[PDB]
Amino acid sequence: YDPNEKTFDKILVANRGEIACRVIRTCKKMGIKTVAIHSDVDASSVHVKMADEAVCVGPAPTSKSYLNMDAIMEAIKKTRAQAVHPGYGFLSENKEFARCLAAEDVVFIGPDTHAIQAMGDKIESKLLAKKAEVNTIPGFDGVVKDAEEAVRIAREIGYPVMIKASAGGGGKGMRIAWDDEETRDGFRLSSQEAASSFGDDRLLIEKFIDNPRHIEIQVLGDKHGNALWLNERECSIQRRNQKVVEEAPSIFLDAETRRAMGEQAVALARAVKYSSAGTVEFLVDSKKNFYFLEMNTRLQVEHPVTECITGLDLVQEMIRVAKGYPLRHKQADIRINGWAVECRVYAEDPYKSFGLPSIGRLSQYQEPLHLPGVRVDSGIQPGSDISIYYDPMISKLITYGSDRTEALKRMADALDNYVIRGVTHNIALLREVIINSRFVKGDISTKFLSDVYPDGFKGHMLTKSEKNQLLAIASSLFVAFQLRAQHFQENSRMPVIKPDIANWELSVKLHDKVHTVVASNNGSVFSVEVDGSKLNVTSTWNLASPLLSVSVDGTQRTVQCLSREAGGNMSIQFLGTVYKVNILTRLAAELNKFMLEKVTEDTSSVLRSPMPGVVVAVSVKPGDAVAEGQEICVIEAMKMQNSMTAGKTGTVKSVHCQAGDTVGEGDLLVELE
């Protein structure tokens, strides 16, 4: 970092979240006063305090606040900001914003308008790519309009051909065909949804590429022409067409293909005349047939892992490029330094549809910054609020080591020492992803989540040894709580006669089985017998700290007692997964055997609202005999469109919702039968 290098003194970040904080910290590192914009809701965000000055925009929704042209222009002209930075999304590809700013005397940090317009269109992108002499996805070179042309193409290229129309900003019209029969009825269907959604009906049918891995190449460009490629980035793990886990030095990729990818990306950037930082996306399959997917003109979300492996700062380099100074690095200077893995901690429940976002307020938040080799990019703090107007994200966790195994181990350690109370995160799913056997080996594809968990996310399957360790830890915590409860102060009027029990016989109900445990205490060491198996658990037994470290049989395990009840219920986080355990004494369990269970009328026939947002599409009416998997309502929330199905067969008793109605979580929408 060179503060002497002159750069725009006043910079406005036209974004929000962790990226705004990252930009603010980078400008502060290079010594630049930074102003930040925020809506009414985000007035208490981290980035507004991290910025030296603030300019409130207006209303809560991002459409009228972070997409408002007039408001942002007012902010620019009132704060006299010398530079603007969009981060990613929002106004990343806003070409009218680019031209209106160019009408003024404020510099935009990012791609030029011409490149954005050229690369935005999928047809134009494919055309320019095939003029650029870069291998592209095999398929029909044109637009199919009738079933006859579709079946002819499927015959003369390949039966597994995607039926994909144009537009598709949210992935709409992205259906796939696999045989001649599909290429006619599915062709009609896809034309129907294309007409319903956008209607341009410009198809881009192309051959399916099996078992691919989405690879990202960081192309750094400038106004001086020369472009540099920065290693690679594997982003194969994807749920619902969204990146979740990214490792930069891709294991499958080898040096010859590294050079090939770098040369292809640089040549394509020169053809596009890119003058900023972007990522080239490749779909190399098991046959090493690389196919250019698309090149994002904005800064990639998962850039910090590339920064970690390369020992470089992309934000500073791109802001220097925007200043006017040429690129100051060479391909020889670029290398690999160990390994690094990054995950996106989102505010979503991974059990429902591989991530169903929730809403809430962070009552407790702690990052494992003290753990070695851990970097946290987060735009929230204790007391922050998750809202329906923005992306359901909590943080980004990046761990770097001298080897892939070391990075994975440090990432597991960081995930086990990360405290989030107030919302439902998805740390569990990330944990099984980074400890999965296939992921550790390297065999990963874009359909990783689809086939590894066919039915969906179930949780961490406990081994017998791990189950014994969990039961021992729970029993030890229970006995520790009782022992602390026995400790009073001296009364001198009615002295306390402390009970002298030596063994605790407990019944622990994990999942469905019931286990008999015998726990004995000796100083700070608990001897626990679970079904005969003997274990020794030793720890400091601090009952107020959120994180508790135990030493079960030498094996060090960090656990979190999320909740505890006087009735014996205990919700405890083991290895990233929350387990419910009911601990009773033996006498209490014997007497509880006589308690009558309360019958719950869980006969379905109802449908709640897991998505807190606005129901924008209702496809049912009172009296509709729906079936299994039939979509009921679509709710826009978290700036994400999610469609939910009934999952069973039953006539609709009544509908308590309408298309475009604000509905929170837990609201009964459609009654069923």
Binding site: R361, S363, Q364, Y365, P382, G383, L543, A544
Partner: protein, 219 residues
């Protein structure tokens, strides 16, 4: 649980929009030891919250207003609930911590015909006769005579603090501070650290009152 633990999550829990409500149970959970709270009558007269908790290991009684339900207005049932809890806590030497966000009493003909005057006077009485240590934190709102009810100094409230969003009025905390109605304006993140300290000082509080067989509480 260290007694100096900061609670930064409380710095932005009170919204600026006076019409918008929040949950006082979140504040109570954040402040008390280990976030453990034995709520008494959790499902009755939910516009007031009473319960037992611990501060630095010592049993404390918690009284607070709930702006989520009925905007925190006091009525007959909440008055009776709070009065009984406060009287019990005073009778057995248990310190009281109060969180005040009351905008006044609930208006209407049903309340007047039900005897809102005497039922409110019950809570006034209960807070006034207490001789145990009393700590008061005004979070946002203290309209009307209800402000006097939550032991506003003159009802022997030992130490009183206001958040920088407290808006003590009749129909900003500066009037209250100038007149002497708060001992300080505290940052919401230091609340716990303050309260514990006060409970150490006031543990030896002793008050002398005129002799009587008993008092005539407006039952």
């Amino acid at each position: 649980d260290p007694s100096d633990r900061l609670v930064p999550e409380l710095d932005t829990i009170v919204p600026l929009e006076s019409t918008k409500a929040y949950n006082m149970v979140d504040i109570i959970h954040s402040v008390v030891d280990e976030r453990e709270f034995f709520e008494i009558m959790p499902n009755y007269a939910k516009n007031i919250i009473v319960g037992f908790a611990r501060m630095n290991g010592r049993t404390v009684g918690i009284v607070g207003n709930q702006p989520k339900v009925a905007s925190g207005c006091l009525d007959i049932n909440s008055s009776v609930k709070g009065a009984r809890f406060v009287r019990f806590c005073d009778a057995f030497n248990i310190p009281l911590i109060t969180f005040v966000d009351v905008p006044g009493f609930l208006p209407g003909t049903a309340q007047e015909y039900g005897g809102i005057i005497r039922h409110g006077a019950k809570l006034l009485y209960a807070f006034a006769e207490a001789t145990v240590p009393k700590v008061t934190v005004i979070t946002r709102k203290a309209y009307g005579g209800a402000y006097d009810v939550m032991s506003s100094k003159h009802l022997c409230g030992d130490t009183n603090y206001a958040w920088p969003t407290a808006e003590i009025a009749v129909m900003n905390p500066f009037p209250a501070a100038v007149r002497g109605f708060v001992d300080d304006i505290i940052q919401p993140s230091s609340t716990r650290a303050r309260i514990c300290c006060d409970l150490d000082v006031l543990a030896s509080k002793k008050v002398q009152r005129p002799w009587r067989k008993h008092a005539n509480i407006p039952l």
